[PDB]
Design an enzyme around this catalytic site. Structure first.
Site, PDB file in Angstrom:
ATOM      1  N   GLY A 170      57.828 -16.380  53.105  1.00 35.00           N
ATOM      2  CA  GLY A 170      59.171 -16.202  53.678  1.00 35.00           C
ATOM      3  C   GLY A 170      59.043 -15.228  54.835  1.00 35.00           C
ATOM      4  N   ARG A 193      87.330  -5.420  47.669  1.00 31.43           N
ATOM      5  CA  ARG A 193      87.541  -6.812  47.333  1.00 31.43           C
ATOM      6  C   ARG A 193      87.627  -7.009  45.835  1.00 31.43           C
ATOM      7  NH1 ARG A 193      81.978 -10.428  46.859  1.00 31.43           N
ATOM      8  NH2 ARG A 193      80.718  -8.690  46.049  1.00 31.43           N
ATOM      9  N   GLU A 236      81.366 -13.806  56.448  1.00 28.63           N
ATOM     10  CA  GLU A 236      82.329 -12.665  56.393  1.00 28.63           C
ATOM     11  C   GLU A 236      83.017 -12.236  57.650  1.00 28.63           C
ATOM     12  OE1 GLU A 236      81.373  -8.408  54.361  1.00 28.63           O
ATOM     13  OE2 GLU A 236      79.939  -9.939  53.721  1.00 28.63           O
ATOM     14  N   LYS A 257      54.697 -22.455  47.494  1.00 25.09           N
ATOM     15  CA  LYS A 257      54.939 -23.737  46.855  1.00 25.09           C
ATOM     16  C   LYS A 257      55.685 -24.696  47.777  1.00 25.09           C
ATOM     17  CE  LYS A 257      59.025 -21.986  44.430  1.00 25.09           C
ATOM     18  NZ  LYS A 257      59.668 -21.880  43.096  1.00 25.09           N
ATOM     19  N   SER A 259      68.639  -6.648  54.476  1.00 26.20           N
ATOM     20  CA  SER A 259      67.623  -7.426  53.759  1.00 26.20           C
ATOM     21  C   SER A 259      66.510  -7.899  54.674  1.00 26.20           C
ATOM     22  CB  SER A 259      68.259  -8.646  53.110  1.00 26.20           C
ATOM     23  OG  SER A 259      67.242  -9.519  52.671  1.00 26.20           O
ATOM     24  N   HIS A 271      74.472 -14.323  44.949  1.00 25.99           N
ATOM     25  CA  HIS A 271      73.833 -14.357  46.253  1.00 25.99           C
ATOM     26  C   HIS A 271      72.553 -13.573  46.412  1.00 25.99           C
ATOM     27  CE1 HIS A 271      73.550 -13.955  50.645  1.00 25.99           C
ATOM     28  NE2 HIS A 271      73.956 -12.692  50.626  1.00 25.99           N
ATOM     29  N   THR A 307      64.523 -17.608  53.674  1.00 27.00           N
ATOM     30  CA  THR A 307      64.832 -16.741  54.808  1.00 27.00           C
ATOM     31  C   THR A 307      65.456 -17.543  55.868  1.00 27.00           C
ATOM     32  OG1 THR A 307      63.244 -14.947  54.619  1.00 27.00           O
ATOM     33  CG2 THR A 307      63.828 -15.704  56.849  1.00 27.00           C
ATOM     34  N   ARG A 320      73.254  -3.733  48.124  1.00 22.30           N
ATOM     35  CA  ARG A 320      72.656  -3.977  49.437  1.00 22.30           C
ATOM     36  C   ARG A 320      73.705  -4.115  50.540  1.00 22.30           C
ATOM     37  NH1 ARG A 320      71.781  -8.145  53.091  1.00 22.30           N
ATOM     38  NH2 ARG A 320      73.253  -9.270  51.736  1.00 22.30           N
ATOM     39  N   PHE A 347      78.499  -6.160  61.291  1.00 22.33           N
ATOM     40  CA  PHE A 347      78.391  -6.972  60.089  1.00 22.33           C
ATOM     41  C   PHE A 347      78.168  -6.045  58.910  1.00 22.33           C
ATOM     42  CE2 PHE A 347      76.154  -9.491  56.901  1.00 22.33           C
ATOM     43  CZ  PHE A 347      76.928 -10.647  56.860  1.00 22.33           C
ATOM     44  N   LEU A 380      77.706 -20.917  51.071  1.00 18.25           N
ATOM     45  CA  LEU A 380      78.476 -19.753  51.537  1.00 18.25           C
ATOM     46  C   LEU A 380      79.495 -19.975  52.672  1.00 18.25           C
ATOM     47  CD1 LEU A 380      75.549 -17.137  51.618  1.00 18.25           C
ATOM     48  CD2 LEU A 380      77.106 -17.657  49.743  1.00 18.25           C
ATOM     49  N   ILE A 390      49.795 -18.284  50.390  1.00 16.91           N
ATOM     50  CA  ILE A 390      50.209 -19.377  49.524  1.00 16.91           C
ATOM     51  C   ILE A 390      51.706 -19.483  49.349  1.00 16.91           C
ATOM     52  CG2 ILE A 390      50.013 -20.379  47.225  1.00 16.91           C
ATOM     53  CD1 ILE A 390      47.514 -17.828  48.617  1.00 16.91           C
ATOM     54  N   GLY A 447      53.803 -16.474  48.539  1.00 18.43           N
ATOM     55  CA  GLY A 447      55.070 -16.617  49.253  1.00 18.43           C
ATOM     56  C   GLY A 447      54.980 -16.522  50.782  1.00 18.43           C
ATOM     57  N   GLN A 450      74.528  -9.085  43.671  1.00 16.71           N
ATOM     58  CA  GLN A 450      75.528  -9.072  44.719  1.00 16.71           C
ATOM     59  C   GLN A 450      76.137 -10.449  44.810  1.00 16.71           C
ATOM     60  OE1 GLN A 450      74.007  -7.700  48.407  1.00 16.71           O
ATOM     61  NE2 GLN A 450      76.028  -7.542  49.363  1.00 16.71           N
ATOM     62  N   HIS A 507      78.665 -13.175  46.483  1.00 16.86           N
ATOM     63  CA  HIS A 507      79.242 -13.356  47.806  1.00 16.86           C
ATOM     64  C   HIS A 507      80.683 -13.830  47.678  1.00 16.86           C
ATOM     65  CE1 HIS A 507      79.850 -14.252  51.960  1.00 16.86           C
ATOM     66  NE2 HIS A 507      78.652 -13.779  52.244  1.00 16.86           N
TER      67      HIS A 507
HETATM   68  C1  LIG Z   1      72.382 -18.245  52.304  1.00 15.09           C
HETATM   69  C2  LIG Z   1      71.830 -16.922  52.470  1.00 15.09           C
HETATM   70  C3  LIG Z   1      72.183 -16.137  53.680  1.00 15.09           C
HETATM   71  C4  LIG Z   1      71.627 -14.829  53.852  1.00 15.09           C
HETATM   72  N1  LIG Z   1      71.988 -14.110  54.992  1.00 15.09           N
HETATM   73  C5  LIG Z   1      71.429 -12.784  55.267  1.00 15.09           C
HETATM   74  C6  LIG Z   1      71.784 -12.023  56.476  1.00 15.09           C
HETATM   75  O1  LIG Z   1      72.498 -12.545  57.333  1.00 15.09           O
HETATM   76  N2  LIG Z   1      71.215 -10.707  56.690  1.00 15.09           N
HETATM   77  C7  LIG Z   1      70.373 -10.086  55.702  1.00 15.09           C
HETATM   78  O2  LIG Z   1      69.914  -8.978  55.892  1.00 15.09           O
HETATM   79  N3  LIG Z   1      70.039 -10.769  54.545  1.00 15.09           N
HETATM   80  C8  LIG Z   1      70.581 -12.069  54.251  1.00 15.09           C
HETATM   81  N4  LIG Z   1      70.170 -12.836  53.041  1.00 15.09           N
HETATM   82  C9  LIG Z   1      69.246 -12.154  52.033  1.00 15.09           C
HETATM   83  C10 LIG Z   1      67.854 -12.340  52.578  1.00 15.09           C
HETATM   84  O3  LIG Z   1      67.835 -13.442  53.483  1.00 15.09           O
HETATM   85  C11 LIG Z   1      66.759 -12.647  51.552  1.00 15.09           C
HETATM   86  O4  LIG Z   1      66.783 -11.535  50.672  1.00 15.09           O
HETATM   87  C12 LIG Z   1      65.388 -12.775  52.165  1.00 15.09           C
HETATM   88  O5  LIG Z   1      65.279 -13.874  53.091  1.00 15.09           O
HETATM   89  C13 LIG Z   1      64.268 -13.050  51.175  1.00 15.09           C
HETATM   90  O6  LIG Z   1      63.065 -13.262  51.863  1.00 15.09           O
HETATM   91  P1  LIG Z   1      61.731 -13.185  51.207  1.00 15.09           P
HETATM   92  O7  LIG Z   1      60.651 -12.961  52.301  1.00 15.09           O
HETATM   93  O8  LIG Z   1      61.659 -12.047  50.127  1.00 15.09           O
HETATM   94  O9  LIG Z   1      61.319 -14.572  50.594  1.00 15.09           O
HETATM   95  P2  LIG Z   1      62.036 -16.070  50.504  1.00 15.09           P
HETATM   96  O10 LIG Z   1      62.426 -16.393  51.924  1.00 15.09           O
HETATM   97  O11 LIG Z   1      63.008 -16.417  49.432  1.00 15.09           O
HETATM   98  O12 LIG Z   1      60.639 -16.776  50.275  1.00 15.09           O
HETATM   99  C14 LIG Z   1      59.916 -16.700  49.040  1.00 15.09           C
HETATM  100  C15 LIG Z   1      58.620 -17.464  49.216  1.00 15.09           C
HETATM  101  O13 LIG Z   1      57.770 -17.446  48.031  1.00 15.09           O
HETATM  102  C16 LIG Z   1      57.320 -18.764  47.697  1.00 15.09           C
HETATM  103  N5  LIG Z   1      57.150 -18.854  46.269  1.00 15.09           N
HETATM  104  C17 LIG Z   1      58.068 -18.612  45.221  1.00 15.09           C
HETATM  105  N6  LIG Z   1      57.586 -18.823  44.042  1.00 15.09           N
HETATM  106  C18 LIG Z   1      56.242 -19.157  44.244  1.00 15.09           C
HETATM  107  C19 LIG Z   1      55.202 -19.624  43.365  1.00 15.09           C
HETATM  108  N7  LIG Z   1      55.329 -19.572  42.018  1.00 15.09           N
HETATM  109  N8  LIG Z   1      53.936 -19.953  43.946  1.00 15.09           N
HETATM  110  C20 LIG Z   1      53.769 -19.996  45.315  1.00 15.09           C
HETATM  111  N9  LIG Z   1      54.795 -19.609  46.239  1.00 15.09           N
HETATM  112  C21 LIG Z   1      56.036 -19.293  45.538  1.00 15.09           C
HETATM  113  C22 LIG Z   1      58.371 -19.647  48.301  1.00 15.09           C
HETATM  114  O14 LIG Z   1      57.762 -20.911  48.491  1.00 15.09           O
HETATM  115  C23 LIG Z   1      58.687 -18.982  49.576  1.00 15.09           C
HETATM  116  O15 LIG Z   1      57.710 -19.191  50.617  1.00 15.09           O
HETATM  117  C24 LIG Z   1      70.733 -14.187  52.768  1.00 15.09           C
HETATM  118  C25 LIG Z   1      70.379 -14.980  51.590  1.00 15.09           C
HETATM  119  C26 LIG Z   1      70.920 -16.305  51.393  1.00 15.09           C
HETATM  120  C27 LIG Z   1      70.573 -17.002  50.170  1.00 15.09           C
END
Ligand SMILES: Cc1cc2nc3c(=O)[nH]c(=O)nc-3n(C[C@H](O)[C@H](O)[C@H](O)COP(=O)(O)OP(=O)(O)OC[C@H]3O[C@@H](n4cnc5c(N)ncnc54)[C@H](O)[C@@H]3O)c2cc1C
Ligand code: SF4
Ligand code: F3S
Ligand code: FES
Lengths: 130, 541, 119, 243
Positions: free
Chosen positions: B14, B255, B246, B38, B360, B320, B46, B355, B117, B243, B36, B12, B231, B233
């Site tokens: 992100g 709510r 807020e 996908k 996050s 969400h 993110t 949360r 926020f 989305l 790595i 991953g 959670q 939204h």
């Molecule tokens: C629309 C939206 C708005 C948001 N706004 C906020 C906010 O304002 N403030 C806040 O605190 N939080 C917010 N969040 C929550 C927060 O953004 C997420 O919890 C956070 O970004 C998740 O990041 P992550 O690093 O865990 O991975 P993600 O960003 O989801 O990335 C996961 C990664 O793993 C990879 N991966 C997955 N499966 C595999 C596989 N089998 N093999 C190889 N790679 C794979 C993907 O390709 C990707 O690179 C929001 C979420 C959403 C959906």
């Protein structure tokens, strides 16, 4: 061995004839033709003016040919398209901040036109009033 | 089976992932890190965040203030020593990011400005316009580029993790384009794959938030903590579940009260039929809508023929954030030596039963760092393993996969997918009943079954997505079942988790102030166990 | 892939001239075409404004020689420049077009100079 | 109520079977809320499970949607069928090497973003010190260039690139110019070498089409142009250093 075989679409020398945006572009960068023909006449006249008094009358009578007239009317319309586009792209070479905001081309643009306007009146004024 | 060697590997890319990679790099300059994903890192979910990331910053604020706002919000199901740690490190991460170029919105003063926020008493939400997620991920991703140690595996779908004698040794992944199997050796793997929000029939997550990783740990006897909490939204558009932020309401924006009201309006004939599930902002005006919701307006005009300044946006709550994830210790490590879960896919015990807005992302940069850090340590302490067992393992994968491919039955995986989402929306919604909940577990198991009669009609090798969506669906079901079961069992009401049945309508700190662990056995049945929450200075009451 | 130590181009030089040429022909070209290309030949002007006698009188004035020069030369470099890239754009092969196009420009520069440097 | 049905055409291509791409036609239901990325979903799910393409955000922020619609580089998620009732052709991103169906080889793209060192450089300030001081005014200097989602569409637009695949590309340059413009950065020299190549800002004739097509309004044309004045500036000093 790999099983990939990347299909590369070829790009033709007529790529621009497709989308109109490309077509408007070619006229701009193609606005250069006339822009030269005029600069060439200029030279003909500069030289013609110096060459002789009687060579001048021939000159004017030349541009007095219906063909030559039209060509210039064209060269002029082109000289304005150019002036028109050139004024729109220019502002983009500048990055100007006015109170936490990058001001657009509308302030620069509108002011370039003004100068341009002021010029013509002058060139025309000096040119024909004396 | 081509063999790649690396010191530590990370699935991953992100915000959490990349943060994990960079520190590992900074931690060990001679390291060979395998990153790595996908999808190329910039497309990670993110990138979708718009609110901002939290970190104490104003002079009148305090850690004990942040701390208190967090436990309080998690309905006391938070591992308090973890919260402490988390809080004191937000500021330090939030500064590194700015220091890496992240354009945090500023003060006329030149300093970094913060917003309110997530309904926190004192604002401590750092922000970059309303594209915070975008900016954090890109800054992270771009920062990483300068490190030679970090070797990337873009568009490599991870099938499984190699584990033997209770210790991780590497992983198998598929070169998506070439369609091959790559086998990576490392003595620690960090796992940040993102949430399982795509499970629901209606969500906000990107199409890659299938919670593979979560499913990937389940197969190996690791539990998924507090998965019964989802959670939802407040504003969700049809199908897209796009989305509507807020911060609109703090400003006169119009709510479990409304949530509930329209939800039980479906049984008496009091709901007002609309095309999807009125957000009227007409009175809003340009300046505020385009400065805080430039994103909100273009997805509305786009997917519903509705301009956020001229017409109302048709909406109904969608899933969400997925709080529960892989069970982790204070070092982000799992019950498998060398296996760390950081990010949303995990459960450091930070959010508890709900949360807090903007925490996050902070978590990401905060634990991400630690996640890479502790990995490097356990990394040079691993010691060698029985090569034959490892290698015998990779074969189980190439085989199980073959078995998966050869599978036939005529079941359209896409139809299954729908049904599962459809069941989740109904049985694990804003309000769960033992009645409807049961129905979803049954539906869920039923589909698990059908999953065995699915046929992948695509046998091609260059970028075969028909095959992947299926593998992804695979995990979807699995995790989706812990959620359900977990929920059904928690016969109480806490934060995210709200029930309507007699004797469960209220929070019970006497019998359920504990954690939920779902284990999936080889028999295919989901077992639940319970652990206790670490209290430090803030006891419940 | 991509050269790690690319060949520094000289384009800025021509873009420099081209830039100035294009700006001048934008502001001044129109009116010039105007007077000379339309007003003068159709005699549309007062008394002897555009007659050989006064024209020469202007042509030999400092501000006059200078102006003529730029008026002619300048546009050249803006125009001939474009015309050069016109090739690429059209995927047109021109033997040493660089020289042909630019060369031509450098030629009339000197010529034009001669034109006005003499009288 | 009832719903319309629209006939849509897609340029499929399988490197294991097809010798060259060939068109395909699918019947897809739709309404005023139906988007193309949503239209693509439909098909794979009911008409041809082998249809491949990149996507994710579903909200024009991920930048993986890049594809061709009637010879126009667009994002499928931000593209709606209500506008194409008179025909809709969808091909793999323009000016790129189709690998399979609508998924294209993004290697050169990424290469470019990497070659220009897109990161803060030479700033000794550390975490403890605190955040760097940057006013909105300094921040506006580069804010716009920063909204890039690496979507691929500007390349598919610039003819100079299509003629010259050795061209680092607009976005690439843009990205660079961003960081050059950021007051917190002191690594401009580390980026100039690429920017001053024949494949740098000087492969541009300023057709002004990339800025016309960016779905995030970054206006790269401006950046490139501004970049020219920079490199054109650099070139000057250089002619003056016998040092
Ligand atoms: C629309 C939206 C708005 C948001 N706004 C906020 C906010 O304002 N403030 C806040 O605190 N939080 C917010 N969040 C929550 C927060 O953004 C997420 O919890 C956070 O970004 C998740 O990041 P992550 O690093 O865990 O991975 P993600 O960003 O989801 O990335 C996961 C990664 O793993 C990879 N991966 C997955 N499966 C595999 C596989 N089998 N093999 C190889 N790679 C794979 C993907 O390709 C990707 O690179 C929001 C979420 C959403 C959906
Ligand atoms: S320059 Fe703009 S349109 Fe092009 S890829 Fe970047 S963000 Fe997209
Ligand atoms: S339109 Fe193309 S020519 Fe350059 S200015 Fe933009 S990339
Ligand atoms: S598919 Fe997400 S940006 Fe279009």
């Amino acid at each position: 061995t790999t099983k990939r075989k990347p299909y590369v679409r070829p790009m033709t020398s007529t790529w621009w004839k497709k989308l109109p945006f490309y077509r408007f572009y070619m006229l701009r960068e193609g606005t250069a033709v006339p822009a030269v023909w005029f600069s060439i006449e200029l030279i003909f006249g500069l030289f013609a003016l110096k060459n002789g008094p009687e060579a001048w009358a021939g000159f004017v009578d030349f541009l007095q040919n219906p063909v030559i007239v039209i060509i210039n009317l064209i060269t002029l319309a082109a000289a304005l398209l150019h002036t028109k586009t050139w004024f729109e792209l220019a502002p983009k070479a500048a990055n100007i901040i006015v109170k936490d905001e990058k001001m657009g081309p509308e302030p620069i643009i509108k002011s370039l036109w003004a100068v341009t306007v002021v010029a013509t009146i002058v060139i025309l004024f000096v040119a024909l009033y004396w | 089976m081509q063999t790649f060697q690396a010191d530590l590997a990370i699935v991953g890319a992100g915000g959490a992932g990349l943060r994990a990679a960079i520190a590992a790099a900074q931690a060990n300059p001679n390291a060979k890190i395998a990153l790595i994903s996908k999808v190329y890192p910039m497309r990670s979910h993110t990138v979708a965040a718009e609110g901002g990331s939290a970190a104490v910053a104003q002079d009148h604020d305090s850690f004990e203030y942040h701390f208190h706002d967090t436990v309080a919000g998690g309905d006391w199901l938070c591992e308090q020593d973890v919260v402490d740690y988390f809080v004191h490190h937000c500021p330090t991460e939030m500064t590194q990011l700015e220091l890496w170029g992240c354009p945090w919105s500023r003060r006329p003063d030149g300093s970094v400005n913060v917003r309110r926020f997530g309904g926190m008493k004192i604002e401590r939400t750092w922000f970059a316009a309303d594209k915070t997620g975008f900016h954090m991920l890109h800054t992270l991703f771009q920062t990483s580029l300068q490190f030679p140690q970090i070797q990337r595996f873009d568009e490599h779908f991870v099938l499984d993790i190699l584990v033997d004698d209770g210790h991780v040794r590497g992983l198998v992944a598929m070169n998506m384009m070439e369609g091959t199997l790559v086998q990576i050796r490392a003595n620690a793997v960090v796992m940040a794959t993102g949430g399982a929000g795509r499970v629901y029939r209606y969500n906000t997550n990107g199409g890659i938030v299938t919670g593979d990783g979560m499913g990937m740990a389940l197969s190996h006897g690791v539990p998924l903590r507090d998965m019964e909490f989802v959670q939802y939204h407040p504003a969700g558009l049809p199908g897209s579940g796009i989305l509507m932020t807020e911060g609109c309401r703090g400003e006169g924006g119009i709510r479990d009260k409304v949530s509930q009201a329209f939800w039980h309006e479906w049984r008496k004939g009091n709901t007002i039929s609309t095309p999807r599930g009125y957000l009227d902002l007409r009175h809003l005006g340009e300046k505020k809508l385009h400065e805080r919701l430039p994103f909100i307006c273009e997805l509305a005009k786009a997917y519903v023929g509705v301009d956020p300044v001229k017409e109302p946006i048709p909406v109904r709550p969608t899933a969400h954030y997925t709080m529960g994830g892989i069970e982790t210790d204070q070092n982000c490590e799992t019950r498998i030596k060398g296996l760390f879960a950081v990010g949303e896919c995990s459960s450091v015990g930070l959010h508890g039963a709900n949360r807090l807005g903007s925490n996050s992302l902070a978590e990401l940069v905060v634990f991400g760092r630690l996640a890479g850090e502790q990995a490097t340590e356990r990394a040079a302490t691993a010691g060698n393993g029985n090569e034959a067992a490892i290698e015998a393992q990779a074969a189980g994968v190439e085989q199980r996969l073959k078995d998966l491919v050869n599978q036939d039955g005529g079941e359209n995986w896409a139809k299954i997918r729908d049904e599962m989402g459809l069941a989740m929306e109904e049985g694990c919604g804003i309000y769960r009943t033992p009645e409807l909940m049961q129905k979803t577990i049954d539906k869920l198991a039923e589909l698990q079954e059908r999953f065995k009669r699915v046929r992948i009609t695509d046998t091609s090798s260059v970028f075969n997505t028909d095959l992947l969506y299926t593998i992804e669906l695979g995990h979807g079901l699995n995790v989706a079942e812990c959620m359900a079961h977990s929920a059904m069992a928690r016969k109480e009401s806490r934060g995210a988790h709200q029930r309507l049945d007699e004797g469960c309508t209220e929070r019970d700190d006497v019998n359920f102030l504990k954690h939920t662990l779902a284990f999936r056995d080889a028999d295919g049945t989901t077992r639940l166990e319970y652990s206790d929450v670490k209290i430090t200075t803030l006891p419940p009451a | 892939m991509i050269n790690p130590n690319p060949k520094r181009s000289d384009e800025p030089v021509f873009w420099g001239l081209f830039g100035a040429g294009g700006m001048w022909s934008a502001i001044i070209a129109p009116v010039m075409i105007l007077l000379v290309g339309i007003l003068l030949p159709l005699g549309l002007f007062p008394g002897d404004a555009l007659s050989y006698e006064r024209v020469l009188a202007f042509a030999q004035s400092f501000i006059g020689r200078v102006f003529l020069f730029l008026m002619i030369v300048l546009p050249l470099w803006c125009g001939l420049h474009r015309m050069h890239h016109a090739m690429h754009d059209l995927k047109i092969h021109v033997p040493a077009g660089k020289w042909v196009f630019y060369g031509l420009a450098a030629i009339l520069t000197v010529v034009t100079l001669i034109g006005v440097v003499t009288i | 109520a009832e719903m319309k049905n629209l006939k849509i055409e897609v340029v499929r291509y399988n490197p294991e079977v097809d010798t060259a791409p060939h068109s395909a036609f699918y019947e897809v239901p739709y309404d005023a809320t139906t988007s193309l990325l949503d239209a693509l979903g439909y098909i794979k799910d009911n008409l041809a499970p082998d249809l491949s393409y990149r996507w994710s955000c579903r909200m024009a922020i991920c930048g993986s949607c890049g594809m061709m619609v009637n010879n126009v580089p667009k994002l499928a998620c931000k593209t709606f069928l209500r506008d194409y009732t008179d025909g809709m052709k969808v091909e793999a991103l323009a000016n790129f090497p189709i690998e399979r169906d609508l998924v294209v080889d993004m290697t050169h793209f990424i290469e470019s973003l990497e070659a220009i060192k897109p990161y803060i450089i030479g700033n000794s300030r550390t975490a403890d010190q605190g955040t760097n001081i940057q006013t909105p005014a300094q921040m506006a200097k580069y804010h716009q260039f920063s909204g890039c989602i690496n979507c691929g569409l500007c390349y598919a637009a610039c003819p100079q690139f299509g003629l010259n695949p050795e061209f680092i590309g607009p976005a690439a340059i843009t990205l660079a110019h961003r960081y050059n413009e950021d007051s917190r950065d002191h690594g401009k020299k580390e980026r100039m070498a690429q920017l001053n190549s024949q494949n740098g800002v000087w492969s541009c004739t300023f057709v002004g089409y990339c800025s016309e097509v960016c779905p995030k309004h970054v206006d790269p044309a401006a950046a490139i142009q501004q970049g020219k004045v920079e490199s054109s500036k650099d070139f000057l000093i250089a002619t003056l250093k016998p040092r």
